[PDB]
């Protein structure tokens, strides 16, 4: 079991760490059908998504996707500094797999 | 996959973007039978709804509908600026499909 | 679709609008068996309940009842001004069907 | 139906009202097998639990028990004054049935 | 029934009390398949996890695991002081069983 986000992200061939060290600039969410997703941005121009759930996810992933959307919303509204994101960089915009917050 | 609210909105028929750049003026919610909805207003007189779940929603949007009302409530209570709403403009009040918050 | 709490409330028998224009004075909640409810009071003496879920309710109201107790708790804790309540006046205390909040 | 926590408590055997008029001094929660509970304390030395779900609880209480833990946590973190607790006094620590907040 | 976290922790083997008396330095959360977990750190170098849910957790702990991650996120965002953690010291990093928070 990894002990930080960088070592977690290393376990997935399909991933990359972004180091932001900045609050979320905008939060977007959608209830439109097949686009039940969130999108966040940073002042540096980075855009990331929390993906729509699909067959790419086992049951535990579904719950954690909902959690991540909860986390990004409150992080936005509290101006919490996001340290790093672990993202899938094959998806466009890059999909969030993990988040670290420190400040 | 859309990278922003406007791209997302532009995916659907009978939608438009409202650019509010303002906090929500009022928040209403009902648990009355057949009217399990929310209504928000802005100072400019704009009124929007999160629709009652009916036939026009696939069962997967049900969770996103619940999340949207949670988002609107906490946005209202934190006085968070709403940047844009993507709405079905053929409903009265116009029906919320997506939201972005910035600044 | 109604555009406001007053018009929504008018769609049901045995309801009326109370116009409080005030913060909730007290918030009570119970997990006791057959009393799984919330009660709020206002400085003016008004007492209102969120009713225990039951036969009088329909399936789509279940989630909305829970949402309403969520809303009253966080309204209480943020000292949010309650504009209006739509309530059933054939219950004691009168039973909340909808709420609006405005600055 | 009761109109306040004192009348509510009187409906049950083995209960009594604790009048605290004070914030929660500490909040503990456990995910440990068979001790999935919350414990709260007050500065005066009072200690109270939200019981582990069990055969003393009917199905309608399950969501209420989870709600009460949500309530205690947020009350703790907001330093919200707890007026009264309705508790079962045939358990150690006494087991919360109902909470009233006012300040 | 335990009245505090220390007496609670003693009911289990391979569990130990860590007294932090400090706020959470960093909060990490992941939705990656098979790593649906939270990691928290403290300034003193201590690292703790909420475990990915698994065959080692009984049914009554599944809800409590999701709650704990909720509790840790909100604790991090409010800079709440963690008094003690009860953890399984046979996991790497050590896995949270319970938390106490006090002023
Ligand atoms: C090459 C790489 O490692 N990643 C790129 C990413 O660039 C990275 O992130 C940006 C913000 C900056 O820190 C770069 O130095 C860094 O390599 C690209 O990001 C785009 O950057 C431009 C710069 O102004 C715009 O801001 C653009 O909107 C950014 O793309 C968005 O954000 C990304 C994280 C992706 O999710 C992308 O799909 C978004 O449109 C992108 C460009 O495709 O490609 C890698 O992510
Ligand atoms: C309380 C009231 O009567 N408000 C109207 C407002 O209509 C409300 O809000 C709109 C968005 C819609 O959801 C209505 O069903 C609801 O009553 C009017 O806004 C216009 O409404 C029409 C037809 O719905 C179009 O939506 C039009 O785009 C709206 O005007 C735009 O939004 C306004 C708030 C202004 O920013 C205006 O400049 C925009 O063009 C307004 C018309 O001013 O009248 C009341 O506020
Ligand atoms: C009227 C009377 O004699 N009450 C006691 C009560 O103590 C009183 O109330 C408590 C909260 C505290 O302020 C006491 O100082 C006060 O005298 C007993 O509560 C325990 O009291 C001792 C101190 O005497 C400790 O403070 C202890 O933590 C208290 O018990 C805990 O909290 C209680 C509310 C119960 O949930 C109990 O199970 C916990 O262990 C109680 C309990 O024996 O007995 C009378 O009510
Ligand atoms: C990032 C890093 O290298 N941290 C170590 C820290 O270990 C981490 O945190 C502990 C709680 C545990 O979850 C580890 O699995 C995790 O990597 C070290 O902490 C000690 O770790 C061992 C187990 O490896 C025991 O848990 C031991 O009790 C821990 O020491 C206590 O906590 C420390 C932070 C100090 O307060 C120490 O005085 C305590 O005894 C520490 C020390 O080895 O070093 C890094 O911080
Ligand atoms: C216009 C009128 O006569 N209305 C009464 C209610 O009395 C009015 O509203 C109260 C909230 C007070 O502001 C009162 O001064 C005002 O005239 C009456 O409510 C009760 O009033 C008594 C005091 O006389 C207490 O305040 C009591 O708590 C009130 O009742 C509770 O709150 C209500 C809104 C309902 O939910 C009741 O079920 C509660 O018990 C009501 C009920 O007697 O009757 C109207 O006709
Ligand atoms: Ca700011
Ligand atoms: Ca801070
Ligand atoms: Ca203001
Ligand atoms: Ca701000
Ligand atoms: Ca005040
Ligand atoms: Ca305000
Ligand atoms: Ca204080
Ligand atoms: Ca206050
Ligand atoms: Ca600080
Ligand atoms: Ca404090």
Domains of chain A: 1-103 (2.40.50.110)
Q: What Å resolution does this PDB entry report?
A: 1.5
Residue labelled with tokens 């930080």: A4
Task: Decide if D28 and E15 are in contact by the 8 Å CB cutoff.
Answer: no
Is some CB atom of chain A closer than 8 A to the CB atom of B96? Answer: yes
The token pair at A82 is 């996001």
Apex CA A68: angle with CA A62 and CA A74, to 5°?
145
The token pair at C92 is 């004691």
Determine the atom of ligand 4 nearest the C-alpha atom of E42: 34
Q: Could you tell me if A94 and A6 are in contact, meaning their C-beta atoms sit under 8 angstroms apart?
A: no
The token pair at C61 is 């109201």
E26: closest CA of chain D, how far (Å): 18
Determine the atom of ligand 3 nearest the C-alpha atom of D93: 38
Say which of B12, B58, B68 has its CB closest to residue A29: B68
Q: How many residues does chain E have?
A: 103
DSSP per position, E18-81: EEEEE--SEEEEE-STT---EEEE-TTS-EEEEPPP-TTS-HHHHHHHHHHHHHHHHHHHHTPP
Is some CB atom of chain E closer than 8 A to the CB atom of D45? Answer: no
d(CA A57, CA E53): 15
- Ligand 4 proximal residues by C-beta, below 6 Å: A 3; E 44-48, 89, 92-94
CA C60 to chain centre: 17
Let me know if B54 is exposed, middle or buried by CB neighbors in 10 A (0-12, 13-18, 19+): exposed
Distance E79 CA to ligand 7 centre (A): 7
Local structure of residue C90 (DSSP, 8 states):
T
d(CA D76, CA B100): 31
**Cα-based distances in Å from E93 to B58, C54, E70, E89:** 41, 46, 19, 8
> End-to-end CA distance of chain B, in Å?
24
> End-to-end CA distance of chain C, in Å?
24
CB atoms within 10 A of CB A79: 10
Determine the atom of ligand 4 nearest the C-alpha atom of E46: 9
Determine the atom of ligand 5 nearest the C-alpha atom of C93: 38
Apex CA D69: angle with CA D81 and CA E51, to 5°?
135
Nearest ligand, CA of residue D25?
15
Q: Could you tell me if C72 and B6 are in contact, meaning their C-beta atoms sit under 8 angstroms apart?
A: no
d(CA B26, CA B47): 9
Q: Could you tell me if A84 and A18 are in contact, meaning their C-beta atoms sit under 8 angstroms apart?
A: yes
Nearest ligand, CA of residue B80?
9
Choose, out of E27, E32, E55, E80, the residue to mutate when testing the contact with A (most A CBs < 10 Å): E32
Dihedral pair phi/psi, residue B53, rounded to 5°:
-65, 115
Q: Minimal CA–CA distance to B64: which of B99, B29, B17, B30?
A: B99
The token pair at C100 is 């609006």
- Which residues have their alpha-adjacent CB atom under 5 A from ion ligand 15? E 103
Contacting residues for A89 by C-beta, under 8 A, at least 6 apart: A14, A15, A16
Dihedral pair phi/psi, residue D102, rounded to 5°:
-165, 145
CA E72 to chain centre: 8
Written in H, E and C, the secondary structure of chain A is CCCCHHHHHHCCCCEEEEEEEECCCEEEEECCCCCCCEEEECCCCCEEEECCCCCCCCHHHHHHHHHHHHHHHHHHHCCCCEEEEEEECCCCCEEEEEEEEEC
Q: Could you tell me if E86 and E17 are in contact, meaning their C-beta atoms sit under 8 angstroms apart?
A: yes
Q: Could you tell me if D38 and D48 are in contact, meaning their C-beta atoms sit under 8 angstroms apart?
A: no
Residue C83 CA neighbour count, 13 Å, CB half: 14
Is some CB atom of chain A closer than 8 A to the CB atom of B97? Answer: yes
Let me know if C44 is exposed, middle or buried by CB neighbors in 10 A (0-12, 13-18, 19+): exposed
The token pair at D75 is 């009350």
CB atoms within 10 A of CB D102: 16
Q: Could you tell me if C57 and B59 are in contact, meaning their C-beta atoms sit under 8 angstroms apart?
A: no
* Chain B contact partners (≥3 CB pairs within 8 A): A, C
Q: Could you tell me if D76 and E74 are in contact, meaning their C-beta atoms sit under 8 angstroms apart?
A: no
Q: Could you tell me if A38 and A24 are in contact, meaning their C-beta atoms sit under 8 angstroms apart?
A: no
Q: Could you tell me if C39 and C48 are in contact, meaning their C-beta atoms sit under 8 angstroms apart?
A: yes
Contacting residues for A99 by C-beta, under 8 A, at least 6 apart: A5, A68, A71, A72, A75, A82, A84, A85, A86, E28, E29, E30
Please tell me the experimental approach by which this structure was elucidated.
X-ray
Q: Angle between the A59-77 and E59-78 helix axes, to the nearest 10 degrees?
A: 20
C29: closest CA of chain B, how far (Å): 18
E78: closest CA of chain A, how far (Å): 9
Is some CB atom of chain A closer than 8 A to the CB atom of B56? Answer: no
Local structure of residue D34 (DSSP, 8 states):
T
Q: β-strands C94-102, B26-30: how paired? A: antiparallel
User: Which helix (DSSP H) or strand (DSSP E) does residue E96 occupy?
Assistant: strand E94-102
User: Which helix (DSSP H) or strand (DSSP E) does residue B10 occupy?
Assistant: none
Residue D49 CA neighbour count, 13 Å, CB half: 21
SS3 C32: coil
CB atoms within 10 A of CB A53: 16
Residue labelled with tokens 């849910």: E53
d(CA E20, CA E84): 6
d(CA C59, CA C42): 30
Q: Could you tell me if C29 and C69 are in contact, meaning their C-beta atoms sit under 8 angstroms apart?
A: yes
Q: Minimal CA–CA distance to C19: which of C87, C63, C83?
A: C83
Contacting residues for D44 by C-beta, under 8 A, at least 6 apart: D20, D22
Q: Judge if the beta carbon of residue A88 lies within 6 A of ligand 1.
A: no
d(CA A48, CA A9): 16
d(CA C49, CA C89): 11
Nearest ligand, CA of residue B103?
9
Given its phi and psi angles, is residue B24 left (phi above 0), alpha (psi -120 to 50 degrees) or beta? beta
D85: closest CA of chain C, how far (Å): 10
d(CA D11, CA D30): 30
Q: β-strands E82-88, D38-41: how paired? A: unpaired
Contacting residues for C4 by C-beta, under 8 A, at least 6 apart: B28, B39, B47, C100
Let me know if D21 is exposed, middle or buried by CB neighbors in 10 A (0-12, 13-18, 19+): exposed
CA D67 to chain centre: 11
The token pair at E9 is 């922790």
Tell me the chain E residues in contact with residue A83 when contact means C-beta distances shorter than 8 Å: 26
Q: Could you tell me if A74 and A27 are in contact, meaning their C-beta atoms sit under 8 angstroms apart?
A: no
Dihedral pair phi/psi, residue E75, rounded to 5°:
-60, -50
Q: Could you tell me if E6 and E18 are in contact, meaning their C-beta atoms sit under 8 angstroms apart?
A: no
Task: Decide if C29 and D2 are in contact by the 8 Å CB cutoff.
Answer: no
Residue labelled with tokens 């009302």: B69
Q: Could you tell me if E93 and E47 are in contact, meaning their C-beta atoms sit under 8 angstroms apart?
A: yes
The token pair at E54 is 């698994």
Q: Could you tell me if B61 and A31 are in contact, meaning their C-beta atoms sit under 8 angstroms apart?
A: yes
């Amino acid at each position: 079991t990894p002990q930080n986000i960088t070592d977690l992200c290393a376990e997935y061939h399909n991933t990359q760490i972004y180091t932001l060290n900045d609050k979320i600039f905008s939060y977007t969410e959608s209830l439109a059908g097949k686009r039940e997703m969130a999108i966040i941005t940073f002042k540096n121009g980075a855009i990331f998504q929390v993906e729509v759930p699909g067959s790419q996810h086992i049951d535990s992933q579904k719950k954690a996707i909902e959690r991540m959307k909860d986390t990004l919303r409150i992080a936005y509204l509290t101006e919490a500094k996001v340290e790093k994101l672990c993202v899938w960089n094959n998806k466009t915009p890059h999909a969030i797999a993990a988040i670290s917050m420190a400040n």
